[PDB]
Design a binder for this molecule. Sequence first.
Ligand code: ZN
Ligand code: ZN
Ligand code: ZN
Length: 99
Amino acid sequence: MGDSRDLCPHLDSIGEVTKEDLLLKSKGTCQSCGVTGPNLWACLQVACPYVGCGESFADHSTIHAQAKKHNLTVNLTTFRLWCYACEKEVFLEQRLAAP
Ligand SMILES: [Zn+2]
Ligand SMILES: [Zn+2]
Ligand SMILES: [Zn+2]
């Protein structure tokens, strides 16, 4: 059972992809559009390594969450998540600290 608000429901189903994955994803460009770093949004499912765009370009965040039904993604622009399911933005459950 999940809890707290920052912690999203599907956030526990995505497990924890490779941290560095969030680091290369933050490389600076969409992997399918090559648009830029700011306003990027890479998928964050237990098994979906790909850095999509944010409206900034075509927002793969939508068609990608729309095609793969993946709701959670992380904006390497501000460091938060986005559940196309809970349809909102969320940061690490904060339960952790000084990682
Ligand atoms: Zn969710
Ligand atoms: Zn995905
Ligand atoms: Zn894209």
